[PDB]
Enzyme design. Sequence first.
Site, PDB file in Angstrom:
ATOM      1  N   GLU A 163      20.024  33.445  67.700  1.00  0.00           N
ATOM      2  CA  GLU A 163      19.088  32.539  67.047  1.00  0.00           C
ATOM      3  C   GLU A 163      19.305  32.481  65.542  1.00  0.00           C
ATOM      4  O   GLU A 163      18.888  31.508  64.907  1.00  0.00           O
ATOM      5  CB  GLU A 163      17.647  32.953  67.354  1.00  0.00           C
ATOM      6  CG  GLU A 163      17.067  32.349  68.637  1.00  0.00           C
ATOM      7  CD  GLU A 163      16.748  30.865  68.515  1.00  0.00           C
ATOM      8  OE1 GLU A 163      16.548  30.385  67.380  1.00  0.00           O
ATOM      9  OE2 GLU A 163      16.683  30.181  69.559  1.00  0.00           O
ATOM     10  N   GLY A 187      44.697  43.944  50.254  1.00  0.00           N
ATOM     11  CA  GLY A 187      45.655  43.651  51.307  1.00  0.00           C
ATOM     12  C   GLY A 187      45.126  43.958  52.694  1.00  0.00           C
ATOM     13  O   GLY A 187      45.316  43.174  53.627  1.00  0.00           O
ATOM     14  N   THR A 188      44.461  45.103  52.851  1.00  0.00           N
ATOM     15  CA  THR A 188      43.956  45.489  54.164  1.00  0.00           C
ATOM     16  C   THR A 188      42.770  44.630  54.577  1.00  0.00           C
ATOM     17  O   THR A 188      42.696  44.180  55.725  1.00  0.00           O
ATOM     18  CB  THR A 188      43.570  46.967  54.163  1.00  0.00           C
ATOM     19  OG1 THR A 188      44.672  47.747  53.688  1.00  0.00           O
ATOM     20  CG2 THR A 188      43.207  47.425  55.564  1.00  0.00           C
TER      21      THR A 188
HETATM   22  N1  LIG Z   1      31.045  46.781  46.992  1.00  0.00           N
HETATM   23  C1  LIG Z   1      32.155  47.506  46.903  1.00  0.00           C
HETATM   24  N2  LIG Z   1      33.365  46.885  46.685  1.00  0.00           N
HETATM   25  C2  LIG Z   1      34.497  47.618  46.591  1.00  0.00           C
HETATM   26  C3  LIG Z   1      34.453  48.994  46.718  1.00  0.00           C
HETATM   27  N3  LIG Z   1      35.708  49.466  46.586  1.00  0.00           N
HETATM   28  C4  LIG Z   1      36.542  48.424  46.387  1.00  0.00           C
HETATM   29  N4  LIG Z   1      35.804  47.274  46.376  1.00  0.00           N
HETATM   30  C5  LIG Z   1      36.333  45.912  46.208  1.00  0.00           C
HETATM   31  O1  LIG Z   1      37.653  45.892  46.703  1.00  0.00           O
HETATM   32  C6  LIG Z   1      38.528  45.211  45.837  1.00  0.00           C
HETATM   33  C7  LIG Z   1      39.841  45.980  45.764  1.00  0.00           C
HETATM   34  O2  LIG Z   1      40.652  45.693  46.882  1.00  0.00           O
HETATM   35  P1  LIG Z   1      40.395  46.399  48.305  1.00  0.00           P
HETATM   36  O3  LIG Z   1      39.735  45.460  49.283  1.00  0.00           O
HETATM   37  O4  LIG Z   1      39.561  47.638  48.102  1.00  0.00           O
HETATM   38  O5  LIG Z   1      41.849  46.836  48.825  1.00  0.00           O
HETATM   39  P2  LIG Z   1      41.923  47.956  49.970  1.00  0.00           P
HETATM   40  O6  LIG Z   1      40.669  47.891  50.801  1.00  0.00           O
HETATM   41  O7  LIG Z   1      42.090  49.321  49.352  1.00  0.00           O
HETATM   42  O8  LIG Z   1      43.196  47.529  50.857  1.00  0.00           O
HETATM   43  P3  LIG Z   1      44.709  47.724  50.350  1.00  0.00           P
HETATM   44  O9  LIG Z   1      45.172  46.466  49.663  1.00  0.00           O
HETATM   45  O10 LIG Z   1      45.572  47.971  51.562  1.00  0.00           O
HETATM   46  O11 LIG Z   1      44.843  48.900  49.421  1.00  0.00           O
HETATM   47  C8  LIG Z   1      37.844  45.163  44.486  1.00  0.00           C
HETATM   48  O12 LIG Z   1      37.920  43.862  43.952  1.00  0.00           O
HETATM   49  C9  LIG Z   1      36.401  45.530  44.742  1.00  0.00           C
HETATM   50  O13 LIG Z   1      35.581  44.413  44.500  1.00  0.00           O
HETATM   51  C10 LIG Z   1      33.241  49.626  46.935  1.00  0.00           C
HETATM   52  O14 LIG Z   1      33.198  50.848  47.049  1.00  0.00           O
HETATM   53  N5  LIG Z   1      32.091  48.876  47.029  1.00  0.00           N
HETATM   54 MG   LIG Z   2      43.570  49.915  50.729  1.00  0.00          MG
END
Ligand SMILES: Nc1nc2c(ncn2[C@@H]2O[C@H](COP(=O)(O)OP(=O)(O)OP(=O)(O)O)[C@@H](O)[C@H]2O)c(=O)[nH]1
Ligand SMILES: [Mg+2]
Lengths: 427, 430, 429, 107, 101
Positions: free
Chosen positions: B245, B135-136
């Site tokens: 570039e 979501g974020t």
């Molecule tokens: N490469 C990498 N991907 C991550 C990591 N943690 C979470 N993800 C990715 O993030 C996805 C989960 O949703 P998020 O983008 O983390 O959600 P959020 O950033 O916590 O935002 P909210 O929805 O508000 O909680 C998963 O599908 C993962 O692929 C990380 O530490 N490294």
């Molecule tokens: Mg989050």
Amino acid sequence: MREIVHIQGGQCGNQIGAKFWEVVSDEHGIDPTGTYHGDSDLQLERINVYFNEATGGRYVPRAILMDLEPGTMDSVRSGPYGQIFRPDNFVFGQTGAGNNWAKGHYTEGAELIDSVLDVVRKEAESCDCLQGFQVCHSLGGGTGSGMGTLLISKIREEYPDRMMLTFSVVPSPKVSDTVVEPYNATLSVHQLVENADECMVLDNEALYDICFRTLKLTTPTFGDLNHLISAVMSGITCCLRFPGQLNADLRKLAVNLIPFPRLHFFMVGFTPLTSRGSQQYRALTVPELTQQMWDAKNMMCAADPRHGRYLTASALFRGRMSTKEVDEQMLNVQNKNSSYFVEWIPNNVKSSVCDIPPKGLKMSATFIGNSTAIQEMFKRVSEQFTAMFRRKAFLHWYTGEGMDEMEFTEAESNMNDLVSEYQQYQD
Amino acid sequence: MREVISIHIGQAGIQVGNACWELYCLEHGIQPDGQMPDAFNTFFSETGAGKHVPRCIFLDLEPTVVDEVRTGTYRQLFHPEQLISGKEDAANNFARGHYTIGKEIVDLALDRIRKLADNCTGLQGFLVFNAVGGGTGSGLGSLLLERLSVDYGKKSKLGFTVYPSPQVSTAVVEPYNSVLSTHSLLEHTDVAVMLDNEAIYDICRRSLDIERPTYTNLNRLIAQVISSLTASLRFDGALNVDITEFQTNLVPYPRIHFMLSSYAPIISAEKAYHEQLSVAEITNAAFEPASMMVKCDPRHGKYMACCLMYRGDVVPKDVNASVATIKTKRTIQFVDWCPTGFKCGINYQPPTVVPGGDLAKVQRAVCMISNSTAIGEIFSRLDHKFDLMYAKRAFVHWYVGEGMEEGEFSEAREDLAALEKDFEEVGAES
Amino acid sequence: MREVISIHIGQAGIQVGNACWELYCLEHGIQPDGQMPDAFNTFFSETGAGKHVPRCIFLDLEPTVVDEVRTGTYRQLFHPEQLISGKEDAANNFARGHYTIGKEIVDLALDRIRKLADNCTGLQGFLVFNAVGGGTGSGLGSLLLERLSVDYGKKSKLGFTVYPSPQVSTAVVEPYNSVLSTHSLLEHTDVAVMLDNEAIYDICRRSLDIERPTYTNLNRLIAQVISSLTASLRFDGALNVDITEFQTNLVPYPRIHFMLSSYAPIISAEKAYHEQLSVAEITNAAFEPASMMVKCDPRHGKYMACCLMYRGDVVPKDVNASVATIKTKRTIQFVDWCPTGFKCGINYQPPTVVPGGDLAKVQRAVCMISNSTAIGEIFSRLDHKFDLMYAKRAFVHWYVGEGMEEGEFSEAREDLAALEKDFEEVGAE
Amino acid sequence: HRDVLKWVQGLDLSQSLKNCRRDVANGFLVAEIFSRYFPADIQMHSFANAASSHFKRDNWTQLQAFCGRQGINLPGDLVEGCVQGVHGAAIALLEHLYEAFTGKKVP
Amino acid sequence: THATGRFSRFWDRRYADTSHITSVDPCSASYAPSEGTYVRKGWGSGDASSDFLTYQGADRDQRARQRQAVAVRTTARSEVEAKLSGLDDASGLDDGRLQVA
Ligand SMILES: Nc1nc2c(ncn2[C@@H]2O[C@H](COP(=O)(O)OP(=O)(O)OP(=O)(O)O)[C@@H](O)[C@H]2O)c(=O)[nH]1
Ligand SMILES: [Mg+2]
Ligand SMILES: Nc1nc2c(ncn2[C@@H]2O[C@H](COP(=O)(O)OP(=O)(O)OP(=O)(O)O)[C@@H](O)[C@H]2O)c(=O)[nH]1
Ligand SMILES: Nc1nc2c(ncn2[C@@H]2O[C@H](COP(=O)(O)OP(=O)(O)O)[C@@H](O)[C@H]2O)c(=O)[nH]1
Ligand SMILES: [Mg+2]
């Protein structure tokens, strides 16, 4: 700083939550006096989610103990970890519900609703941001069922944005403490569908089944069930109270689980349950948790999940765990038996991990599962309700307190409505 | 001078960037407290006497991932009010991150971007780290990139967006969020670099011989991609490439700006004594489909344009020898209208190894960032995934009630559908 | 990792397994309390720190043999949940072990199999132990192997079934159970290693000079056969012979999977000092009909396939000197369409000696498992016993009342009659 | 039969038939046929000639996706039989493609 | 002393110690001795990173121990092999027969 306000109702609600506050205070390091004696600073990082700081370093729970009889209020107070609670939050009646849903809802509980709505409002305004409201009660009783669900109706008009965690236990056929038990269950579920954001369903016949074949306990006392439920509630909020590689709040688990507003009944199983003879012979690994978590005998509802397809699923992992090893086990359990998973919701399982396991455990997990197999338990309550109601059995206690028979038919008309909308996703 | 402001959105943005800012301090010798015991000017600001502050913001609606940076080892590194926290998380809800609770925190987000962009003399680009599944990352990342387009016109922005994977995903409402975020980063992001978690799981399994990788192992070598791509601004080399570039050489059409990433030497400490890292060896290893960080196979599509970021002891003589061997390979082909596809950059500093890391001491490295028509099939994996999701309207009551109207789901759908027609028409033989 | 699961069904299965697991724990140095004071992965699954549990299930409807393990000298070794006991035994009834009191215990049996199967990464096969003369070993053994084929397809199953003897039997209704149990293992077991109690009685009388033997003496040198069969997976050797190697070299047809067994050096320490155990001298003892573990004459049939499992200080040259001299000897006879019928497997570890066993310290050993057409003479004797038995229809109301229909006795009779027909024509020139 | 043997020889593919059931198992020959009848839509460069199961599934998934896009139909059961190497599936797919591409008659 | 009179008479059976159903044996594989439970993810510190990712160190050390044990076993087998293959006509055989004759 996402706070949860806990409300306990009745004999079942107070005894479950008193054991719940013992576990979370042990995990956060609060002694029975009320001070802090933990070893790490992580216990104070998110102490405010369940505890309000007081003068002198004492921490008091955000708990609103509520009952229609004064006997059970002294039961929590007299036991260990009973002095932490604020005496102002001890709201109690004098007469008792008498296993009467109408007395809890309409006649006798109404004199205490204005009293308990004041302390709910006092506790919500004291904290900064409400994550939601946690309620634990029964559905076969009269206090937690009747007077409990009208508190759910009242707290949703006042706070329609925050969450509602209802750890409501449902009446069982095999264990039947009450003979008007299907009466109070059908009336409460009608008030539970239209109000609560999410509901976790527990049954005592499944908790007995866990205590017999998994834990191998010869004489399961009445508080051994509540410690299993304590591990349930400690697992749901594990990402709120502790850091994690992948966090999951109560709102995040809600959106990932329910596809439609009425499908908000789950069933929970705490994963690493081992008997004392088998403790030295079982090795805790990430794959070894997955086989017990998805086992049908481990889930605390009487419904067998093999009968109906899993709609969605949620996994709450705690400990030093590899996220590749965590989430490749979710694709193994989705590929091995795809007949038990629904097709139009691809990748049904939500997985999240925490790096702080519970006390004394190297690794732990908690499962939240929205399934269409949970309709089988509502059918048994509806079958017993339809058996008694056509003969107008026991109704003079109900109709004598101002509850007409029209809402008895409306409650059943919502009972098969929830069953029907469950059933059409099983095909 | 030259500077980049790296914004990190969502939990995945913070954790990737937390491994990034570990790598940048070891690159320039900056201690965790920020005291040095001129190449630091791009990522770090010299403040007062003997103190370096990063040019980054850590914004996330959930407070529990941003205070970990506050409490942790790099407490003295960052400005305390530069790490933006929120009251509650978006909770995997695009409507919450874009409309309901993302509108309140983004006002403070633009305020510190104005403070950071005023500090730098010549701003070179924006690094956007987010995951569109959450979501974020999707919701707040959409409106932040939209507000950056109107506040700063023509200024370059780089999008390192972690993307949902075919086989594995950590959530259920992710195909709803990624489709809605696809429209947002189609027009706003100038160069969007796709990243996929299963492919980076696969790299650590075979190349780094760890049978249980975690998110910590992914972000350390994701940080190696960001450091290698941005190394030309910091350190001198034979063929330096800037951000301006980089766009003109890799983006043939304004709506085709999706990239695939590959880092060639991924070698453990035990293997590195026997492994041979020639310039032609790493160029062959970079174009191997197993070495990609996106779950995508370039054989299905055509390589429209390519970039090669050579680090370490690489002479400009033998980089062209490796280019000729790739161009004569039968399995690798370019599009007909791009005769010169490779746009190579060479730097003179070898990559460093983080303490406790898994990558070994390596003389020469290649960070291959290429545009391909094979990217059209990862958008089609969640074109079909989201279509059956939306076919009978699941998880829409969460998104309808939080400000978003029903019709915005359709608008994000033919945005993806017309995106699919664009890759097959552009890669078609003419 | 090479890793196997052992299943012991019935009274014979538990007591053979007690002698078997006594020997595997001694081979790897596993003390009975479960602590070692790298090859154990095929038989013991290490659980965390300082504990190795067997990959076995001890299921029996008879409760008295299951809890003997629970209170014996190996309480701390076995997992308590893997030890499966029932309320009442099948009581020599194939109908009871299959239909009436077999269903309520086989569901818990597969559940423990599921937990053992997904814990082990590369499962090689199932080493099933049962007795076709009893109620549980024949009945529950039939029902378990029905479910193992459906749940786990194309996966190897090795069967060491104790088969009734013509002269001696400890029961009266053994011809009923053994005939009915043969159809279950014909279509479902991939390797059937026959064992006969009278033959192991005759092995004990002349080899170890133990002229009043018990079942404990029988199960100890049975355990040497099972361990040397699987010793190739555990310890390194010149010629590794995996589980999947045994089927492709010893069964020429899917319906022919019955093999004789022999263990060549079986001597006491008062006999071992005078005897010079050479590889040629040992291999001649393996092919001797006296050392066969089934009461059968290999000379009546023809050797269709063979397998040799050498242990200890065996140079890979002298095994070929033993194979060459055996092929020249005319008292054995190989079938005309199998010119190369030997499979030699050499292991570099001498066999362990259990404290208290009748066997002595030997620097070399041979475990012989050979497919022969003489097994058709085994089933022919029990076919005559059952044909006389079923003709006047006695001891049938026990089977009929406990679920089994009358025609299942008839249908199991042409199953052995067709097995007689196949074994005659395959060995025919 | 003889008509499809003449037809596959006229396409002049690099792969030799021999045992065609094992030959077309990897999908390279049918991929070459589809590349010849549709040069712009399908090229040989998007296909790897290997006996690996994953590469075989990738090639047949490409063929299924593009024929479903272009309207040409071959049975998914026949695709499964070809990738599992059952007898007669390759032959039946050969005459089915022979009828599907340019219309003739089978005896 | 903080007990109501009706609950103090049967306080022992009512509350007791219900922590045993989730607590484990200290000498078991499931136990964690209150030190690895509260680990923090270590970015700047390599030893803290290894402590947080100790399972990677665990299986790396398991593979190293396995290869070291295989090396020891193969060196012992090679020593026995060399000693056994050193025998030939130049070895000390038949010399006593020649001396006696
Ligand atoms: N490469 C990498 N991907 C991550 C990591 N943690 C979470 N993800 C990715 O993030 C996805 C989960 O949703 P998020 O983008 O983390 O959600 P959020 O950033 O916590 O935002 P909210 O929805 O508000 O909680 C998963 O599908 C993962 O692929 C990380 O530490 N490294
Ligand atoms: Mg989050
Ligand atoms: N080799 C060997 N055979 C045994 C042993 N015990 C029993 N048997 C054989 O088993 C046959 C009878 O079946 P059992 O195994 O004793 O009993 P069961 O199969 O469990 O059937 P139930 O007792 O009714 O449950 C006898 O004919 C014996 O030959 C033993 O300890 N060693
Ligand atoms: N698991 C569990 N169930 C309980 C507990 N206390 C009561 N119950 C259940 O609650 C039901 C009756 O609840 P009741 O006492 O009438 O609740 P009340 O009317 O609100 O006081 C019985 O069927 C019990 O099984 C408890 O501590 N744990
Ligand atoms: Mg028995």
